Amino acid sequence: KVKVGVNGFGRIGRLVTRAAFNSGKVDIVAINDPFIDLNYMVYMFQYDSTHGKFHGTVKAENGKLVINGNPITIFQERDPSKIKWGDAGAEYVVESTGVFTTMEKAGAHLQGGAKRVIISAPSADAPMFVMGVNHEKYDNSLKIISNASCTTNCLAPLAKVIHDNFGIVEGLMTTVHAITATQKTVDGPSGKLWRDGRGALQNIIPASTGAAKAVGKVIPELNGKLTGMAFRVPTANVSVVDLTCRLEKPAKYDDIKKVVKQASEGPLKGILGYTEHQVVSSDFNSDTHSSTFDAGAGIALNDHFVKLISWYDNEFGYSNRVVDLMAHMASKE
Amino acid sequence: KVKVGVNGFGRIGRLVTRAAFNSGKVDIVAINDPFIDLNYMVYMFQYDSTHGKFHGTVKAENGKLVINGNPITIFQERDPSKIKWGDAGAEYVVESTGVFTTMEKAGAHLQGGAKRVIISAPSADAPMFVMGVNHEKYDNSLKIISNASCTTNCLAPLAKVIHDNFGIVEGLMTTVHAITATQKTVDGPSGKLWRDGRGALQNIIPASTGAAKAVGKVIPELNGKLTGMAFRVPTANVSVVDLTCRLEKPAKYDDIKKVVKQASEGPLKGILGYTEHQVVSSDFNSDTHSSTFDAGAGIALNDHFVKLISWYDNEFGYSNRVVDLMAHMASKE
Amino acid sequence: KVKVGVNGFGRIGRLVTRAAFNSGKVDIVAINDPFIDLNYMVYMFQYDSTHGKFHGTVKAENGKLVINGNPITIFQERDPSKIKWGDAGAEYVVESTGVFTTMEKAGAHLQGGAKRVIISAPSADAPMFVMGVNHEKYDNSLKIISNASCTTNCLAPLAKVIHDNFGIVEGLMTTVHAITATQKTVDGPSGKLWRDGRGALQNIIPASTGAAKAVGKVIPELNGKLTGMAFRVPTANVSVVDLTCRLEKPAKYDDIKKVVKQASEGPLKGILGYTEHQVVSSDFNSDTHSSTFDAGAGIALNDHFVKLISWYDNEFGYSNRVVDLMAHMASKE
Amino acid sequence: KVKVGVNGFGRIGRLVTRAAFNSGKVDIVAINDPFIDLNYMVYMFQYDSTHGKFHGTVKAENGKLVINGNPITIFQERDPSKIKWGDAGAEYVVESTGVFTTMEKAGAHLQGGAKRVIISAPSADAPMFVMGVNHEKYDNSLKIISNASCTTNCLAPLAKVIHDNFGIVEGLMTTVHAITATQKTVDGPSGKLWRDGRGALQNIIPASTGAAKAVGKVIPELNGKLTGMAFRVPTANVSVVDLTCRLEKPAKYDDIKKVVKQASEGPLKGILGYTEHQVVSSDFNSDTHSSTFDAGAGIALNDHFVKLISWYDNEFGYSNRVVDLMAHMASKE
C-alpha cells in the first residue's frame, strides 16, 4: 500500500480522506491543518451535510485521529517546509489547501520528506494528469503532479471518447456549477470577482472557467479548440457540464450514445458512466463517477453540430479520482 | 385606450395586470378566474414574493376588484364560451391559463365578444408575434395572436441583431431557467415528464425547450438553425439564455458587443438591453427588459464561434411585453 | 411475518415501503396507486432526492414490482372498496393517500379484505397509537388504527419522559417544519390556507398544527395542556420541535438531560434518541429515530420554566414507526 | 441636519446609508472601509440582492462617492484612531464593522473627532438605547451609545406593550433567523461555534441569542425574565420572533391583539406594526418596521399562557432604526 498525507482539511481534504478509507486504495497516515484542532477534525469528518454521515468510527485518542481503527498523525503547521512529512512516513502528500499550487510551493512538502506531491487544484507549471485520459503518460521521474479540476475531470473523459470517435473541430462548454465555499451566503466583498461576492442563495453567478482550456492541455489534439463559462447556482453538491461542439465527421445522436456507452462499459469504467434514465442532479450525489453522460438531455441540431450533457458530483467524484491517481502512481513505481 | 380582459389569475395573469396598471398602456376591465374568489384575488395581487408588494390600492367593493381606483369586473366561468366578454366591454382578452392554446379554444373567448384573443403561451396554430422582432408583420385581419414564450421572447431580439449583423449558420441554446409552478417542492408524480416531478429545491432539472424552434418561426431565415435545452435550477425569478452559435461572417467579440449596444440604444429599446456591469440574476429582478445582454459572461473561441449570454426576468419581462403587444395592436387598428 | 398492502405511492407510501424492505419487519405484498403506472413506480422508488437512492433492485416484470427479489402486486383503483385487498393476501393495509382518514373511508379497505387498516395521517375518529407512548394500549379488537402525525410522533416520546419525571403544568410547541408537497414552488392558489399557497423557496410560512393537541389524546394526563404552531421553512427533509413548558416540579437542565438520556438508552430506544454533539438538521437526515433530543440547543430560564429541543426526520422516522406499529400489532395478534 | 460618518461598508453599513439617503433624516458625509475600494463601493451600494437596486445615482468622481448628488468622503483606515473623522466634519459616527463593540474601541472614533459614536452591534459596556422603548432616557452627556441588535430591536417594542398592559412573569423566545454573512455556504471551519460552520443552504442551525437578555437591560422590570434561542434557516432577508410568555394578569388573545393595535397606531408607530393579513416572510421584505406583530400566527393556551409572533426585516428595519436613533440624539442636543 501507499501511505498518503493530506494537507488541509478543507472540503477536498476531508473527502479525499473519506474516499481513501472507503475505497481502501490508499492509507492516510497523516493530516495537517494549520487552523483546525483535532477535536474539531473529528466533528468535521464525522458529519457532512452534502455527503451524509461518515460510516465507521472517527475518534481522537492521544493526538491521533483514529479513523476505522487506523491512527492518523495530526500536524498544525502553516508553512509546508515546517511539516514533518518524512517523520510521518508519508510517501505521497496531497496539497488541497489550494494556496500552494505553484510547483515551488509544492516542493516545500517535498523537503518535508514526501516523495511526491499531488495538487488537487489545477496548476499551470505542474503537469496535469487527469485519470483515464492521460494517466498512462505518467512517469516515475515526475515528483509533482496535478489532478486538474473537478470540471476538467468531468469534461476530458467525454472529450476523449467523442474526439477520437467523430472528431471535434471546435467546442464550447457551459457548466451549471454547484455552490462553493468561495460564494458568500449574502452579498459580500470579494475583491477579485465582484460576481462571486454576490450571495449564492438568491443569485445565479456567471463565472469564468479555465477547465476547457485545461482539457486542451491534457488532450493535446484538442488544445485551442475548447473554452468555456460557468454558472454558479444554489445547488449544494452536483453540477452539470454541457459541451456544444461541431464534429469533424458526421454523427447521429444514437451513434454518439453508443460510443459513450461502449467506453463506459470498457476502458473508461468508473471514470466515465452512461445513464439513459430520467436522472436529476440528486441522483448523482455521492457518486464515484468523475463524469456521467446523460443521454436524454443532449440535443443535436445536425449530425455535425451536437450538444452533450454530463453530470459530475464535483466534491466526491474528484476526490475519488485523486485516490485513484495515487494508486496508479504507486503501481508505476 | 384599449380595454383588456384577463383569463386566469395565474402567475402570468397576475403580472400581466400589474404591468398594465403600472405601465398604464392598457386598462384592465375584466378578470376571470374559475377557482379564485374575489377576496383571494385581492390577496394574491397585493402580495407577490418574487416581485415585491403591489404599489397602489387593491380593494374588493361590490364584486369589483378596484385596483388604483379602477373597478375590474370579476367572472367565475370555467369554459370561455360562457364568459360574458362582450358584456364586460373588453376589446382584447389575454388567455393566460394556458390550457386554451389552440386557436379553437381561443375562439371561445371570441364568441364571448372579445374582438381579439392573445395567447400568453406558445401556440402552434396561432401566429406568434414577439415584440420587437416580427411585431410589424401584424395585420388587422388576424384575431388570434400568440406572444410566444418568455424564453423565446428573450432569445429572438438577440438573435435578430446578431443574425442580421454577422449571420448565424447554426445555433444551440442552453437556458438556466428559474423555478416554475410546474416543478413540485419535493419529489412528486408528474406523469408527462418524470424529470419535472422531481423536487425543485434540491435538484437541477434538465428539460426540453421549444423556444429556439419558435424563434425559427418568428424569424424566418433562422428557422431550422436553432434548437435547445433548459435546466431548471432553484432560483425564484430570473433566468439566463445562452446561445452558442457559429457566425457566417467573422466577428470580434467587441464588434458583437457594439452592435448589440447600438441596437439596445436604438430600435430594440426596452425590448433589448445591454449591460457591461458585473451583474447577477438578482439585479435583473423586476425588469421590463425582455432580453438583457451581458457582455462580460460570453466567451468566443473564434471570430466565427461565439457564446452569447442574455438574462431575462421570465415572469415580469414577458408580462410587460404582452401589454406592449396589445398597445401595438390597438395602434394598428 | 405480516403481509402489508400500501395505499398510495406518495411520499409516505414510498418511504413506508422502503423502510419495510430495509428493516425487514413487514413484507409488502401489494401497492395501489390510482394514477402512478408500474414503470413510473420503479422510477419513483429507485430515486429519492431527500433519501438517496434505494439500495437493492427494483424491477418491473409481469405487472409486478419486484423489490429485493420480492414481487409486489400492483393495483390501479381509485375507490378502496374496489381494491382486491383480500385477493392480494394482505393482512394489514396502510392508508397513506390521506384523503381517507375517517374511519368509514378506512373501512372500504376492510371490505377489500384487509384484516386491519392503518392510517398514516392523524384521524379524529380512529384511535391513535403513537409507538413507544401508548402502543401497549392496543388490543386485538380494534381494526382501524392511526399512527398520528410526524410532528406528534416526535413530540410525544419527549413529552412522555418529561411529564412523568418532572410534570408539565402547561406547554407550547413551535415546530420549524420542512417543506411539504402541499407548499407550492412559487406563489400559487391554495384556497384553504392562503398562507401555504405562498411559495416555499422564498417564504417562511406560519401554519397551525394540531400535533400538540394530538399528544394530549395519546397521553391522557397531558390533554388540554399542549397546543402549538409551525413554521414552514425551505429545508427539504428534517424539522425541529420546540417545547416550551413550565414544569410542576423543579428541574435543573442537567437533570432533564439525564432523564432523557436514561430513557433513550432504556425503554424509549429507537423511538427516542439523545445527542450531545453539535448537531444540525442534515445530521438527522435518513434517521430512524422518530424523536431525537438535542441537549445543547434548549435553554431553561428557571428550574420550572424550560425549553426543550427535539429534531425529527419527518419523512423517514415516521415511516419507520409505521412499520414498527404493524409489527407490534402482529405480535399482539 | 446632522452629518453622519459610517465605519464599515458591510451589510449594516451599506443599508444604514441607504436608509439615510432615502429617509433623508441624516446626511452621510463620510464612509470608511479598510478593504473596499471606491469603485467597488459604487457596485456594492448600487446592487443589493436582498433589497433591490438602489434608486438614485451612485457615482465615483474625484475620490468621492456621489450618492443622490451628495459627495461622500471615503477613508481607507484599519484603525479608528487613524481615521480623520473631524476633518470629514462628521458629528456622529456609526460603528458597523462590529469588531469595535467595546467602548474603548469605540472611543478611537471619538479621537478622530466624532462627537458621538453609535454601535450597530450589541455592546455590553455601552448603554443600549433601542428606539421606541428606552430612547427617551438618552441624555446629552453620553457619547457612546449602542442600538442593540436586530433581534432585540424587534422583541422590545412588543415586550414593552405586553408587559405594561398585562404583565409578564416569565418569557422564552424562539427566533427563526435569516441567513447571515457568518454562515458559510457549505460546511466550513468556524472555530467558535461548530454549529455555524455547517452550511446555511442545507441545514437548520440552532444558535444562542442574547437578545432576550438585552431586552432585560433596555426594559428594567423585565430583566431576568427573558432568555432565548435562534434557528438559522435558509431565508435571505426576513426573520420571525416568537415570545412564549406567561402573563401576570389574565388576557384574552383578542385583548392582546387590541393593545398591540392601539400601540401601533399611537406611540409605537413605525417602531411597531400590527397586521391581521395572512402575511408571509416575503411580505415583510424591505420593511421600515423594526417589529411587526402578526395576529393570526400566535396561539394562546390559556389567558395566562400566550404565544406572540412578530416578524422583523432584520437587515432593513434595524438600519432604519439606527438612522432614527441619531435623529433623536440630534434633537436632544
mmCIF file of N, CA and C in Angstrom, chain A residues 217-304:
data_model
loop_
_atom_site.group_PDB
_atom_site.id
_atom_site.type_symbol
_atom_site.label_atom_id
_atom_site.label_comp_id
_atom_site.label_asym_id
_atom_site.label_seq_id
_atom_site.Cartn_x
_atom_site.Cartn_y
_atom_site.Cartn_z
ATOM 1 N N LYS A 217 -4.928 21.013 -22.525
ATOM 2 C CA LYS A 217 -3.591 20.585 -22.135
ATOM 3 C C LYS A 217 -3.521 19.065 -21.992
ATOM 4 N N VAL A 218 -4.440 18.473 -21.235
ATOM 5 C CA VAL A 218 -4.402 17.023 -21.022
ATOM 6 C C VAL A 218 -4.578 16.233 -22.320
ATOM 7 N N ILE A 219 -5.464 16.665 -23.215
ATOM 8 C CA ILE A 219 -5.574 16.009 -24.517
ATOM 9 C C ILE A 219 -4.944 16.978 -25.495
ATOM 10 N N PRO A 220 -3.761 16.647 -26.022
ATOM 11 C CA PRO A 220 -3.048 17.602 -26.882
ATOM 12 C C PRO A 220 -3.788 18.040 -28.140
ATOM 13 N N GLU A 221 -4.316 17.100 -28.912
ATOM 14 C CA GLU A 221 -5.006 17.425 -30.153
ATOM 15 C C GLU A 221 -6.056 18.493 -29.906
ATOM 16 N N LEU A 222 -6.881 18.306 -28.886
ATOM 17 C CA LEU A 222 -7.968 19.244 -28.604
ATOM 18 C C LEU A 222 -7.540 20.648 -28.194
ATOM 19 N N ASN A 223 -6.266 20.853 -27.882
ATOM 20 C CA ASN A 223 -5.838 22.161 -27.392
ATOM 21 C C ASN A 223 -6.173 23.291 -28.343
ATOM 22 N N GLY A 224 -6.707 24.376 -27.796
ATOM 23 C CA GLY A 224 -7.058 25.528 -28.606
ATOM 24 C C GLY A 224 -8.426 25.428 -29.242
ATOM 25 N N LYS A 225 -9.125 24.326 -28.991
ATOM 26 C CA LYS A 225 -10.462 24.154 -29.543
ATOM 27 C C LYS A 225 -11.548 24.125 -28.477
ATOM 28 N N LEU A 226 -11.175 24.171 -27.202
ATOM 29 C CA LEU A 226 -12.190 24.219 -26.153
ATOM 30 C C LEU A 226 -12.066 25.372 -25.165
ATOM 31 N N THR A 227 -13.108 26.190 -25.024
ATOM 32 C CA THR A 227 -13.110 27.245 -23.998
ATOM 33 C C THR A 227 -14.493 27.232 -23.329
ATOM 34 N N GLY A 228 -14.672 27.910 -22.203
ATOM 35 C CA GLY A 228 -15.957 27.850 -21.531
ATOM 36 C C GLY A 228 -16.411 28.913 -20.564
ATOM 37 N N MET A 229 -17.523 28.654 -19.884
ATOM 38 C CA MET A 229 -18.029 29.579 -18.879
ATOM 39 C C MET A 229 -18.837 28.765 -17.878
ATOM 40 N N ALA A 230 -19.055 29.304 -16.686
ATOM 41 C CA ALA A 230 -19.783 28.568 -15.661
ATOM 42 C C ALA A 230 -20.842 29.398 -14.966
ATOM 43 N N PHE A 231 -21.931 28.768 -14.547
ATOM 44 C CA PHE A 231 -22.953 29.480 -13.796
ATOM 45 C C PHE A 231 -23.037 28.851 -12.422
ATOM 46 N N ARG A 232 -22.926 29.658 -11.379
ATOM 47 C CA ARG A 232 -22.999 29.133 -10.029
ATOM 48 C C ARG A 232 -24.438 29.246 -9.584
ATOM 49 N N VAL A 233 -25.062 28.130 -9.232
ATOM 50 C CA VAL A 233 -26.486 28.144 -8.910
ATOM 51 C C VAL A 233 -26.660 27.630 -7.493
ATOM 52 N N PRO A 234 -27.853 27.843 -6.861
ATOM 53 C CA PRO A 234 -27.914 27.374 -5.468
ATOM 54 C C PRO A 234 -28.159 25.879 -5.301
ATOM 55 N N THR A 235 -27.236 25.039 -5.754
ATOM 56 C CA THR A 235 -27.365 23.598 -5.562
ATOM 57 C C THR A 235 -26.164 23.150 -4.754
ATOM 58 N N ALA A 236 -26.382 22.391 -3.691
ATOM 59 C CA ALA A 236 -25.277 22.006 -2.811
ATOM 60 C C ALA A 236 -24.141 21.095 -3.286
ATOM 61 N N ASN A 237 -24.439 20.014 -4.003
ATOM 62 C CA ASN A 237 -23.368 19.053 -4.331
ATOM 63 C C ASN A 237 -23.030 18.653 -5.766
ATOM 64 N N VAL A 238 -23.984 18.690 -6.684
ATOM 65 C CA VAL A 238 -23.706 18.175 -8.034
ATOM 66 C C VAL A 238 -23.855 19.212 -9.137
ATOM 67 N N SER A 239 -22.993 19.141 -10.149
ATOM 68 C CA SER A 239 -23.051 20.096 -11.241
ATOM 69 C C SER A 239 -23.112 19.382 -12.574
ATOM 70 N N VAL A 240 -23.482 20.113 -13.622
ATOM 71 C CA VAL A 240 -23.578 19.525 -14.957
ATOM 72 C C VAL A 240 -22.755 20.252 -16.021
ATOM 73 N N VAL A 241 -21.996 19.511 -16.824
ATOM 74 C CA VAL A 241 -21.182 20.100 -17.889
ATOM 75 C C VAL A 241 -21.890 19.938 -19.227
ATOM 76 N N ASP A 242 -21.853 20.970 -20.063
ATOM 77 C CA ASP A 242 -22.520 20.907 -21.354
ATOM 78 C C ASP A 242 -21.570 21.296 -22.475
ATOM 79 N N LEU A 243 -21.242 20.346 -23.342
ATOM 80 C CA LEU A 243 -20.307 20.621 -24.421
ATOM 81 C C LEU A 243 -21.021 20.773 -25.745
ATOM 82 N N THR A 244 -21.055 21.990 -26.269
ATOM 83 C CA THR A 244 -21.657 22.201 -27.570
ATOM 84 C C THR A 244 -20.500 22.174 -28.528
ATOM 85 N N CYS A 245 -20.494 21.208 -29.436
ATOM 86 C CA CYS A 245 -19.355 21.073 -30.326
ATOM 87 C C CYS A 245 -19.731 20.735 -31.749
ATOM 88 N N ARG A 246 -18.885 21.119 -32.694
ATOM 89 C CA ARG A 246 -19.138 20.753 -34.073
ATOM 90 C C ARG A 246 -18.195 19.615 -34.391
ATOM 91 N N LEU A 247 -18.748 18.443 -34.679
ATOM 92 C CA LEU A 247 -17.915 17.306 -35.032
ATOM 93 C C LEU A 247 -17.190 17.510 -36.347
ATOM 94 N N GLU A 248 -16.144 16.727 -36.570
ATOM 95 C CA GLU A 248 -15.416 16.746 -37.835
ATOM 96 C C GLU A 248 -16.092 15.796 -38.796
ATOM 97 N N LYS A 249 -16.560 14.670 -38.274
ATOM 98 C CA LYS A 249 -17.206 13.674 -39.112
ATOM 99 C C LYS A 249 -18.645 13.562 -38.663
ATOM 100 N N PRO A 250 -19.556 13.245 -39.593
ATOM 101 C CA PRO A 250 -20.963 13.242 -39.189
ATOM 102 C C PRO A 250 -21.214 12.262 -38.074
ATOM 103 N N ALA A 251 -22.192 12.555 -37.225
ATOM 104 C CA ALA A 251 -22.607 11.592 -36.218
ATOM 105 C C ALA A 251 -24.059 11.692 -35.837
ATOM 106 N N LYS A 252 -24.770 10.577 -35.858
ATOM 107 C CA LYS A 252 -26.150 10.586 -35.414
ATOM 108 C C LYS A 252 -26.080 10.535 -33.909
ATOM 109 N N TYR A 253 -27.068 11.096 -33.234
ATOM 110 C CA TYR A 253 -27.013 11.146 -31.780
ATOM 111 C C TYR A 253 -27.026 9.746 -31.174
ATOM 112 N N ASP A 254 -27.564 8.772 -31.896
ATOM 113 C CA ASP A 254 -27.647 7.426 -31.355
ATOM 114 C C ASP A 254 -26.280 6.809 -31.512
ATOM 115 N N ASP A 255 -25.512 7.252 -32.499
ATOM 116 C CA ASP A 255 -24.131 6.794 -32.601
ATOM 117 C C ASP A 255 -23.304 7.363 -31.462
ATOM 118 N N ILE A 256 -23.529 8.627 -31.130
ATOM 119 C CA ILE A 256 -22.832 9.265 -30.014
ATOM 120 C C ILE A 256 -23.174 8.506 -28.748
ATOM 121 N N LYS A 257 -24.442 8.156 -28.598
ATOM 122 C CA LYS A 257 -24.889 7.436 -27.411
ATOM 123 C C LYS A 257 -24.219 6.086 -27.291
ATOM 124 N N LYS A 258 -24.021 5.423 -28.425
ATOM 125 C CA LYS A 258 -23.400 4.102 -28.435
ATOM 126 C C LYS A 258 -21.941 4.149 -28.046
ATOM 127 N N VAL A 259 -21.176 5.033 -28.671
ATOM 128 C CA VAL A 259 -19.745 5.066 -28.399
ATOM 129 C C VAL A 259 -19.460 5.396 -26.940
ATOM 130 N N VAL A 260 -20.227 6.306 -26.353
ATOM 131 C CA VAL A 260 -20.053 6.608 -24.943
ATOM 132 C C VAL A 260 -20.371 5.366 -24.120
ATOM 133 N N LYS A 261 -21.472 4.693 -24.439
ATOM 134 C CA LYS A 261 -21.858 3.503 -23.696
ATOM 135 C C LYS A 261 -20.774 2.446 -23.780
ATOM 136 N N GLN A 262 -20.204 2.269 -24.966
ATOM 137 C CA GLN A 262 -19.159 1.277 -25.138
ATOM 138 C C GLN A 262 -17.962 1.648 -24.285
ATOM 139 N N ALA A 263 -17.604 2.926 -24.283
ATOM 140 C CA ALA A 263 -16.473 3.381 -23.486
ATOM 141 C C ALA A 263 -16.728 3.198 -22.006
ATOM 142 N N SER A 264 -17.944 3.496 -21.570
ATOM 143 C CA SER A 264 -18.271 3.389 -20.155
ATOM 144 C C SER A 264 -18.148 1.957 -19.681
ATOM 145 N N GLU A 265 -18.573 1.012 -20.510
ATOM 146 C CA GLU A 265 -18.544 -0.377 -20.091
ATOM 147 C C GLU A 265 -17.175 -0.987 -20.313
ATOM 148 N N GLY A 266 -16.350 -0.347 -21.133
ATOM 149 C CA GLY A 266 -14.999 -0.843 -21.308
ATOM 150 C C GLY A 266 -13.879 -0.112 -20.607
ATOM 151 N N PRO A 267 -13.030 0.623 -21.371
ATOM 152 C CA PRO A 267 -11.871 1.149 -20.632
ATOM 153 C C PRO A 267 -12.177 2.323 -19.718
ATOM 154 N N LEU A 268 -13.035 3.251 -20.111
ATOM 155 C CA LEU A 268 -13.397 4.319 -19.195
ATOM 156 C C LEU A 268 -14.511 3.850 -18.277
ATOM 157 N N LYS A 269 -14.204 2.891 -17.411
ATOM 158 C CA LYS A 269 -15.188 2.403 -16.452
ATOM 159 C C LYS A 269 -14.924 3.110 -15.148
ATOM 160 N N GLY A 270 -15.967 3.584 -14.480
ATOM 161 C CA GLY A 270 -15.766 4.357 -13.268
ATOM 162 C C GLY A 270 -15.397 5.784 -13.607
ATOM 163 N N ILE A 271 -14.406 5.975 -14.465
ATOM 164 C CA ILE A 271 -14.045 7.310 -14.894
ATOM 165 C C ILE A 271 -15.207 7.938 -15.647
ATOM 166 N N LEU A 272 -15.844 7.162 -16.515
ATOM 167 C CA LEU A 272 -16.990 7.662 -17.267
ATOM 168 C C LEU A 272 -18.184 6.755 -17.036
ATOM 169 N N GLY A 273 -19.395 7.301 -17.061
ATOM 170 C CA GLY A 273 -20.584 6.474 -16.921
ATOM 171 C C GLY A 273 -21.750 6.924 -17.762
ATOM 172 N N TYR A 274 -22.501 5.976 -18.305
ATOM 173 C CA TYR A 274 -23.593 6.324 -19.201
ATOM 174 C C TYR A 274 -24.939 5.960 -18.594
ATOM 175 N N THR A 275 -25.844 6.930 -18.487
ATOM 176 C CA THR A 275 -27.182 6.645 -17.972
ATOM 177 C C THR A 275 -28.292 7.101 -18.905
ATOM 178 N N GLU A 276 -29.218 6.204 -19.219
ATOM 179 C CA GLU A 276 -30.358 6.586 -20.047
ATOM 180 C C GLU A 276 -31.567 6.993 -19.222
ATOM 181 N N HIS A 277 -31.531 6.755 -17.917
ATOM 182 C CA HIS A 277 -32.686 7.054 -17.070
ATOM 183 C C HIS A 277 -33.026 8.535 -17.052
ATOM 184 N N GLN A 278 -34.199 8.874 -16.530
ATOM 185 C CA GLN A 278 -34.563 10.281 -16.416
ATOM 186 C C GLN A 278 -33.947 10.810 -15.144
ATOM 187 N N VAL A 279 -32.629 10.940 -15.135
ATOM 188 C CA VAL A 279 -31.920 11.377 -13.942
ATOM 189 C C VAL A 279 -31.942 12.863 -13.641
ATOM 190 N N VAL A 280 -31.682 13.216 -12.389
ATOM 191 C CA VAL A 280 -31.638 14.618 -11.977
ATOM 192 C C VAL A 280 -30.383 14.759 -11.139
ATOM 193 N N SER A 281 -30.026 15.972 -10.736
ATOM 194 C CA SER A 281 -28.759 16.181 -10.028
ATOM 195 C C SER A 281 -28.611 15.378 -8.753
ATOM 196 N N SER A 282 -29.684 15.233 -7.999
ATOM 197 C CA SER A 282 -29.637 14.499 -6.743
ATOM 198 C C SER A 282 -29.242 13.047 -6.942
ATOM 199 N N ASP A 283 -29.668 12.452 -8.046
ATOM 200 C CA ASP A 283 -29.365 11.050 -8.310
ATOM 201 C C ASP A 283 -27.862 10.839 -8.387
ATOM 202 N N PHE A 284 -27.126 11.867 -8.788
ATOM 203 C CA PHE A 284 -25.679 11.758 -8.932
ATOM 204 C C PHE A 284 -24.932 12.142 -7.668
ATOM 205 N N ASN A 285 -25.628 12.261 -6.544
ATOM 206 C CA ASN A 285 -24.963 12.715 -5.333
ATOM 207 C C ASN A 285 -24.172 11.555 -4.763
ATOM 208 N N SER A 286 -23.030 11.843 -4.140
ATOM 209 C CA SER A 286 -22.172 10.781 -3.607
ATOM 210 C C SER A 286 -21.789 9.785 -4.691
ATOM 211 N N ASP A 287 -21.502 10.287 -5.886
ATOM 212 C CA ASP A 287 -21.082 9.417 -6.980
ATOM 213 C C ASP A 287 -19.575 9.242 -7.015
ATOM 214 N N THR A 288 -19.111 8.141 -7.586
ATOM 215 C CA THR A 288 -17.681 7.901 -7.711
ATOM 216 C C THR A 288 -17.325 8.363 -9.102
ATOM 217 N N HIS A 289 -18.274 8.222 -10.020
ATOM 218 C CA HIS A 289 -18.057 8.626 -11.415
ATOM 219 C C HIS A 289 -17.655 10.076 -11.623
ATOM 220 N N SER A 290 -16.433 10.308 -12.084
ATOM 221 C CA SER A 290 -15.994 11.670 -12.349
ATOM 222 C C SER A 290 -16.880 12.296 -13.404
ATOM 223 N N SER A 291 -17.244 11.546 -14.437
ATOM 224 C CA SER A 291 -18.175 12.069 -15.431
ATOM 225 C C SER A 291 -19.298 11.091 -15.695
ATOM 226 N N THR A 292 -20.542 11.551 -15.685
ATOM 227 C CA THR A 292 -21.629 10.653 -16.051
ATOM 228 C C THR A 292 -22.446 11.258 -17.180
ATOM 229 N N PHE A 293 -22.390 10.654 -18.359
ATOM 230 C CA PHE A 293 -23.115 11.177 -19.509
ATOM 231 C C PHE A 293 -24.604 10.955 -19.378
ATOM 232 N N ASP A 294 -25.396 11.948 -19.756
ATOM 233 C CA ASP A 294 -26.840 11.793 -19.734
ATOM 234 C C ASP A 294 -27.223 11.744 -21.188
ATOM 235 N N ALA A 295 -27.992 10.739 -21.580
ATOM 236 C CA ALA A 295 -28.300 10.594 -22.989
ATOM 237 C C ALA A 295 -29.497 11.438 -23.362
ATOM 238 N N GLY A 296 -30.533 11.404 -22.535
ATOM 239 C CA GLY A 296 -31.733 12.161 -22.837
ATOM 240 C C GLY A 296 -31.603 13.657 -22.981
ATOM 241 N N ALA A 297 -30.836 14.290 -22.104
ATOM 242 C CA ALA A 297 -30.748 15.747 -22.121
ATOM 243 C C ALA A 297 -30.148 16.373 -23.370
ATOM 244 N N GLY A 298 -29.074 15.799 -23.897
ATOM 245 C CA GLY A 298 -28.408 16.421 -25.028
ATOM 246 C C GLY A 298 -29.171 16.432 -26.333
ATOM 247 N N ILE A 299 -29.176 17.573 -27.017
ATOM 248 C CA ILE A 299 -29.912 17.685 -28.273
ATOM 249 C C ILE A 299 -29.015 18.109 -29.431
ATOM 250 N N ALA A 300 -29.088 17.384 -30.543
ATOM 251 C CA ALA A 300 -28.217 17.682 -31.675
ATOM 252 C C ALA A 300 -28.944 18.331 -32.840
ATOM 253 N N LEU A 301 -28.527 19.537 -33.213
ATOM 254 C CA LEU A 301 -29.128 20.220 -34.353
ATOM 255 C C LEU A 301 -28.867 19.512 -35.665
ATOM 256 N N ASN A 302 -27.635 19.070 -35.872
ATOM 257 C CA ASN A 302 -27.252 18.446 -37.131
ATOM 258 C C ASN A 302 -26.375 17.285 -36.755
ATOM 259 N N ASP A 303 -26.045 16.432 -37.712
ATOM 260 C CA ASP A 303 -25.123 15.365 -37.395
ATOM 261 C C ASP A 303 -23.822 15.997 -36.948
ATOM 262 N N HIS A 304 -23.373 17.025 -37.655
ATOM 263 C CA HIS A 304 -22.173 17.744 -37.235
ATOM 264 C C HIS A 304 -22.282 18.537 -35.931
#
